[PDB]
Amino acid sequence: TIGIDKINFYVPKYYVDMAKLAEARQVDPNKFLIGIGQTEMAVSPVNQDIVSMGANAAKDIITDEDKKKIGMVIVATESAVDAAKAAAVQIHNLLGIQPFARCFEMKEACYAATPAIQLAKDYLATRPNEKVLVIATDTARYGLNSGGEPTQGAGAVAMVIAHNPSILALNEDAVAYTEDVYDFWRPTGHKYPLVDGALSKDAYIRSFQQSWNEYAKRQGKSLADFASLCFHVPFTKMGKKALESIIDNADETTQERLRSGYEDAVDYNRYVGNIYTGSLYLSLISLLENRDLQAGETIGLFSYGSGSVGEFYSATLVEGYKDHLDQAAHKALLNNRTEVSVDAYETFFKRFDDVEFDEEQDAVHEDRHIFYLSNIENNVREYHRPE
Template sequence: MEIGIDKIGFFAPHMYVDMTNLAVARGVEPEKFTIGIGQSQMAVAPITQDPVTLAANAALEILDEEDRAQIDMVLFGTESGIDNSKSAAVYVHHLLGLKAEARAVELKQACYGATAGIQLAKGHIALHPESKVLVLGSDIARYGLKTSGESTQGAGAVVMVISAAPRILALDNDNAFLSNDIMDFWRPIYSEQAFVDGKFSNEQYVHFFNEVWKQYKEKTGNDLADFEAICFHLPYTKMGWKALRTELPNADESTQERLKANYQISTAYNRNIGNIYTGSLYLSLLSLLEQKEDLQAGAKIGLFSYGSGAVGEFFTGTLQPGFQRMLKKTDHENLFATRRELTVAEYEKIFEETLPKDGSTIELDIESDPAAICVAGMQDNKRLYINKEHLIEQK
């Protein structure tokens, strides 16, 4: 029985800041951002969007009534969750109107959370082939204004429906994975911003890729030549390239050129959204699927997932016949085309807007946010969520 990605979609806030403008405002050469880390634009989340609403909006794009009837598990990978007890998955389950007979759980291991969700979903589907699992990767990366990590911020969510007989990507069962207790990136519960040892984290990312790739080759006998493309977790778009280039010299020239070209295609969306933590790898996959026009069914795709702290995994899948029909390329083109560019001053003001830390009541202006699902405010220490589409149906 084949199990894999049946549907995939993503959502990002309706605002962004241009990285060249941000560099100038910070007294940095623009090429440091646009070439050095490979970022052009950075999505900016308004106060009316959080990881729950980003994920729910992304899911609205792809779910139909058949999905709602068959989804009996919601797995939410995030490292910017909103509650230390209640899972973000429960909120999304309600906002999407999924059936009550379902499990809903939040998963945390830095940027690896969504990958963990996929692997757990595969096991569930193997036992219950009639079921579907909704896997969400949603985060808002925040390091603070004028910090060293500011240029690798971002916001967005990727969602996937995992099922038997998948129509996009059938996942193989030859995964290679590795865990090691390291302190390259972490965020204690008392801190609003993460701590990072940047040089060490970059080194560990490459090291983990090398190790799981070696393990994968020994397990399967496959090599780089067997892949049409390899997608990477991308906190910034140059990160994956640092890992890939360490292995490319072991391939023939045509394989090197193919993988380099397809790597660049796979970074297109990430370059203009920024870092979305748990969803970054799958935004890279989506970029490849929608931007490479001659991608063919039967092509083998490699995926490298990395979550600081750290867990890494290399796994693979095969594109299915007619996979293009399951994509939402036009919707995603519209999402990018309709975003509003912010000045650096506007971005800074929006960044400083946060929900009350003392649980006090606040009502937010959701009319200024075009998204269907928004944070409407807070009351009695509870976030209030609104699904505008549901309100329209009720009227």
């Protein structure tokens, strides 16, 4: 068996209340709270870039034996800080992983972490003694008062792929679907994405339907075979709509089960926002910790990336996986964050666009036990490492 042996996520220590943003934005809060289904939005302090966030997600799950057995570090992102250098090189360094490993990035909007773990599995096929570290790290920024602003978020998800995994076994049924469309994209030079809101909803659902249909055809399966589905989450309601568009043909028992699983799946996401490549996987953690799925049961996953590329595959829960999750820590991570006014949020957002450091505003003193961008000198990013 080969699959997700360890998994974890990290989000920045700040967040803005969606009800507060709605008011500040002069809109019905329920448009956010219910309409798109988001309650709290992660706010990025300058001392947290995709590298530090990435390192932070991975630090709590990487052991010494892991550092010795990891043969590849893959970073999925659409929030790259370098046009050439893979953020995976810095993370590999910060984490102290053994030198003889491949380090690179994969890019395709919100889709990239999927081909990373899937190809990681393929790589491990004949390497039972090796492991692979996949990191999804991104900052979803649309710009103040923009259409996509309410769906913004930032964070990272780290996954350790290996043989005889403790949590999930990746099955051999993945099928991808590519369709050239301009629902969302970010031409070089643009700080923020260009987006056709309505079309992005249609593109997502179509990609999901095509992928699922072909999957169902190739594997001779139906929704009833799944304990629960897990989707890429730009905002909780997006996946809800996509799910609804196909479960009508399913039985009432199946409809109730998948509808319930979905809620557990998007529990964490509601308090973070879109984290691009990591959204699906943050949702997977939420599902694994908020639901009591039994070992042996199968989960169906749909990965999406605007542009667009979609993919559906399954994974089976390993015996005793509950003993390898960190629900308490994750609950704490979200709860122990500090709320910031819409005003402060906008200040943070502006400073971030220019990487304007400020140990006081970012409250750098509090981050003694984590990785953070401490400074940029001579176009080189420097990082503080967990004391």
